[PDB]
């Protein structure tokens, strides 16, 4: 099986319920990393480091707020998948909110590693709207709790922390998928990475990623297809094989201003 066969499936509308898994690869072409004081990169989402020095995380918060970055071809492709009534759900590891901006509604999304839309005082555990700390974060200040002075951390999943309970939508989405799209992740983080195994054995799995990662490398199924290389390139080659290149380009420079 090949990338052409997968494109033929979508075009025929044989794949009615597409489930997508995305990671950091799809947001790099918009200029998002993954000027800081980080001992190693992962420490930005680690609690022992965060409590020692919250500033590098809050630098990224200030960066990741709406406006600064734009969705790229990858996002807009997934927006076409929804527009044509083909997206069952999008599962994302990203915390940059670009899926929402591209036009994917909240109901078609699982922000599996959390969100800046709300926050919690790390000490007393009072909940905050994510706008209630905006001024502070923008003014290079560490947000503090009105009631106890503890650092107010955004609801981003740090290492060791449980994922939001919305993640449980995977129990009903994955068994129901007729096609799985893995785009721009090296499937390193658990339990997200494990979802690739949750689709039925007869289900096509399409990896559009830099390298052969996860279960596609270790225990490949017959209907798995890898389009290795740059993610943007890989997406465009599927878009072309679908006949959506014109519709895409119309969508992309429509969505700028």
């Amino acid at each position: 099986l090949s990338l052409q066969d997968v494109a033929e499936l979508i075009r025929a509308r044989a794949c009615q319920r597409v489930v997508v898994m995305v990671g950091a690869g799809i947001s790099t072409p918009s200029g998002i990393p993954d000027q800081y004081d980080l001992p190693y990169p992962e420490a930005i989402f680690e609690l022992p480091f965060f409590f020692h020095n919250p500033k590098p995380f809050f630098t990224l918060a200030k960066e990741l707020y709406p406006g600064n970055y734009k969705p790229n071809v990858t996002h807009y492709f997934l927006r076409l998948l929804h527009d044509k009534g083909l997206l069952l759900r999008l599962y994302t590891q990203n915390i940059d909110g670009l899926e929402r901006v591209s036009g994917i509604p909240a109901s078609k999304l699982v922000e599996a590693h959390g969100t800046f839309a709300s926050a919690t005082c790390t000490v007393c555990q009072r909940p905050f709207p994510g706008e209630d700390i905006r001024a502070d974060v923008m003014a290079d200040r560490v947000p503090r709790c009105p009631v106890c002075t503890g650092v107010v951390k955004p609801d981003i999943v740090f290492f060791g922390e449980p994922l939001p309970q919305r993640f449980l939508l995977h129990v009903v989405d994955f068994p129901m998928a007729d096609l799985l799209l893995i785009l721009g992740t090296s499937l390193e983080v658990e339990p997200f990475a494990s979802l690739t195994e949750a689709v039925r054995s007869s289900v096509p799995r399409l990896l559009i990623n830099r390298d052969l990662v996860g279960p596609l490398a270790w225990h490949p199924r017959s209907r798995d297809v890898a389009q290795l290389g740059d993610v943007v390139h890989g997406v465009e080659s599927l878009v072309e094989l679908l006949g959506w290149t014109e519709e895409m380009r119309d969508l992309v420079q429509r969505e700028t201003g």
Partner: peptide, 6 residues
């Protein structure tokens, strides 16, 4: 819990 493989 959110963990790396390695």
């Amino acid at each position: 819990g959110k963990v790396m493989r390695r």
